[PDB]
Assembly symmetry: C2
Homo-oligomer: 512 residues x 2
């Protein structure tokens, strides 16, 4: 492929016969463009075909040189041209300072994700439904498991598996049972995963890839493989996927429920991922409720947690930002649904409230939905169709947060529990769940690390009804007092008449 | 001193004339009792007197050997006997697992401290008043600055300073201005501090010693000394005080307001303390509101923070425990007082509520009070007399938490926001601030990492009115249902009639 865009993939392939196990063959290349130089591993893709993938990050005239344990694939050379990324290619998502994210091209990224753990393991018609739902919804990230999920309500047998089957046996309790050849991957499994990740990429969705998880417990045994096998898998999947710009590594979902693995195993596996990632994708690890790994380790780019506690209030979310000084994502806080399980029974309003709280506190929050309806797929695990109401409100919320000039944070942390800022003279004030008809115009004088709020400034107010998905301009222009006991009021003690409803947020901005 | 208790001090002293600066003289000793061996630094104490202090941690027949750059203090040997600690000597406070504390003898320690930043820098009658107040109150820790404090409402000139004065000059604006000889400590300043720390020890109070702070800003300059001086001071004060069992090191109060120091300076200064502490006292650092240092560094034993956010609810406190897996102390959350400043204007109720929230969530919380009244000393900075009401409630709260069989934690973290546990079948349920007359008997089935709450168990309820400082036995005995949607109820759907008041806690225990 002679011409590729910055942050797309350049791919080499070789047809080669091997005497032994082709998955043991060493293959790599070094890519050079002036001062830019990168060495990456290749992989075997079945049918006597080896591949090396590269994601160039600079435009120019590139060259490469291969290295292999097979002479015919060793010392192979060629060239290609890399052109600037096109308007909708922003590159990978990167950390931006201590709290936020940006695409590689400088474009702001706010993760507003959902959950579809085993959507790539369902029948084809369900997978197509899931893609349709992703196309309609406003989510720009999805938590998804590489390996299939065995769980309450999730019993569908996958059609593809990551390894070849060495043999099938009749088991302890009479039933059929596949024994894996852990030395041979099934390339079709990974090719399928790649097709889906690319489809997400075209929808603008980051694939938050869960590399390991506990949702197995002997059904297949992918949660209890040896560390030699775990490392071989990591090396293989990184060789295949590290060139895919929209991938994030999630080391685990509910790490502390994987009984075969110790904390030391997780540190080893994490280091292995990072060492085999030439491009430095985002990397974190998710735990049981209120379980916090050592996120301060340099391998991790951000915090990825299961805990509703930080989203019970915006201030609680804000504390986490100061503790970690890495971006914080509450990747699981409860899901909107009708399940008997306390993790899957939120009202759509509560789901929406938790996401709002985290956003306004300066963190990010992932959605999920799980409505059981006969034998229909349930989204959080299986994909299919979105049946709930909170997914509509997260789409509206994206429009709100993306319209602000900077990321959100508390204006006067720990002191004012309701006022967010997204810039100089740019506020979102949460009216809260205590229903009322009137809010006195009152702001902190402190505005995070922006300049203090000045006197004689004229502000307009917009009433944002988050549940109703509406923005209504208020006709009164407010005028700021001097600082008075850490606060700033309107000169005539005015306020805003609001609907007697929960989930009202006021957007207060300077009259231009 | 030929016979010493375990965790008391053995002290050597030598009379010696020195040609040069006596504060530059190298002096140390190695103490041995069988397999127990410790090497500690000595110090110059003025009047041609050098000292070496040691805190033995095991009973037996001890010996020592000194080392010095002065021949007469080098290779000196002797012996002493160490006996078991007496009934009220529990040793230093140590970390106990991920979340709690114990004295060295295994006795439980719950920090229920107060604040008196510059109490050792006041006139004598004020310092005696502060001692009397400490004796009456129930606090077992006090946050206190080594160096004097210059602040709004705190302008008293200290009588003693940590360094000799090289000269006094008429300054920019005409006034007198002391220039320090940073190469010579004033031993009297440190002797005074030691007297007070020992008095605290006899009261059962831990001296949480703030080594550096920003409350100076050029009045004296102790906040802007060179790192060479900072290190010399650290080495000196550790040599003097590391043997005092009731000391904790606080690297700073409001570290991030000390403009002359970078994060790298703080890491250096912290490593210097730890390298010069033969015994491993508690060590942390306090910041500005909602400022979190890298508490995960191994130098720190615990988290010491200024932030009311974690005590806004017990769940918020509980989250910090899981994050850090070191003990957590909200050492500053607002003070009860009448000041115009938002740090010093809590009601006594709110001060009490914050402390209760933290305790119930499994962390610890420090009190302060600051009532301005004419020119009278204001406790948070100057000591003197306690004028508020919350200090009475923290004393009652001690008796409650110490009566429980284990430390407190949430029974069903993040899911149940009101139920604390201190053991199997041992609950404190917070009724909250929303005033009501009745609580339906309802508990989680989960009980932290204890066994689940069983059916057919009989519970009594004690109504604890935290503000009124009363415990009242409720006459109904409740009996548990089976697990029903993660909860457990009373078999007859009963509950507890309670006072229509805030700050009611129910203590629920098996009959
Ligand atoms: Ni775009
Ligand atoms: Ni879960
Ligand atoms: Ni920050
Ligand atoms: Ni800007
Ligand atoms: Ni007017
Ligand atoms: Ni005692
Ligand atoms: Ni302060
Ligand atoms: Ni724990
Ligand atoms: Ni026990
Ligand atoms: Ni009965």
């Amino acid at each position: 492929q002679d011409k590729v865009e910055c942050w797309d993939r350049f791919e080499l392939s070789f047809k080669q016969v091997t005497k032994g196990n082709p998955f043991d063959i060493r293959l790599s290349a070094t890519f050079v463009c002036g001062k830019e130089k990168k060495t990456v591993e290749g992989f075997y893709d079945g049918e006597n075909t080896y591949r090396i993938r590269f994601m160039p990050a600079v435009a120019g005239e590139w060259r490469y040189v291969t290295s292999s344990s097979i002479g015919a694939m060793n010392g192979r050379k060629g060239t290609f041209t890399v052109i600037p990324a096109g308007k909708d290619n922003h590159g990978m998502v990167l950390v931006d300072g201590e709290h936020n994210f940006k695409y590689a091209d400088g474009t702001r990224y706010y993760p507003m994700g959902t959950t579809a753990y085993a959507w790539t393991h369902m029948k084809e018609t369900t997978q197509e439904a899931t893609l349709k739902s992703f196309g309609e919804a406003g989510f720009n990230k999805v938590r998804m498991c590489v390996f299939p999920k065995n769980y309450s309500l999730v019993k569908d047998e996958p059609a593809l598996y990551p390894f070849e089957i060495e043999k099938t046996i009749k088991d302890k309790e009479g039933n059929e049972r596949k024994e894996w050849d852990f030395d041979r991957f099934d390339p079709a499994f990974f090719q399928h995963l790649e097709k889906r990740i690319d489809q997400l990429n075209r929808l603008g969705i980051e694939a938050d890839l869960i590399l390991f998880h506990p949702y197995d417990k002997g059904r297949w045994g992918f949660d209890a493989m040896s560390n030699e096998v775990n490392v071989r898998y990591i090396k293989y999947i990184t060789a295949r996927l590290a060139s895919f710009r929209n991938v994030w590594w999630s080391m685990a979902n509910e790490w502390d429920y994987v009984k075969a693995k110790t904390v030391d195993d997780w540190k080893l596996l994490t280091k292995t991922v990072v060492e085999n990632d030439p491009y430095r994708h985002l990397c974190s690890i998710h735990g049981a409720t209120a379980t916090y790994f050592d996120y301060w380790m340099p391998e991790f780019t951000h915090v990825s947690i299961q805990d509703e506690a930080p989203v019970l209030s915006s201030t609680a979310s804000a504390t986490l930002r100061k503790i970690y000084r890495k971006p914080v994502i509450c990747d699981e806080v409860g899901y909107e649904g009708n399940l008997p399980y306390r993790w899957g029974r939120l009202s759509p309003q509560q789901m929406t409230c938790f996401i709002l709280n985290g956003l306004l506190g300066g963190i990010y929050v992932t959605h999920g939905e799980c409505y059981q309806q006969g034998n229909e797929p349930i989204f959080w695990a299986q994909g299919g169709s979105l049946k709930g109401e909170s997914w509509k409100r997260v789409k509206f919320l994206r429009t709100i947060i993306e319209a602000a000039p900077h990321p959100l944070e508390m204006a006067d942390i720990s002191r004012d529990l309701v006022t967010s800022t997204a810039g100089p003279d740019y506020y979102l004030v949460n009216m809260g769940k205590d229903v009322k008809g009137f809010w006195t115009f009152n702001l902190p004088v402190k505005n995070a690390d922006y300049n203090k709020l000045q006197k004689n400034k004229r502000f307009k107010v917009e009433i944002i009804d988050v549940w109703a998905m509406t923005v209504t301009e208020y006709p009164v222009i407010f005028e700021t007092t001097e600082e008075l006991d850490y606060r700033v009021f309107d000169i005539h003690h005015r306020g805003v008449r609001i609907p007697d409803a929960p989930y009202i947020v006021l957007r207060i901005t300077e009259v231009k």
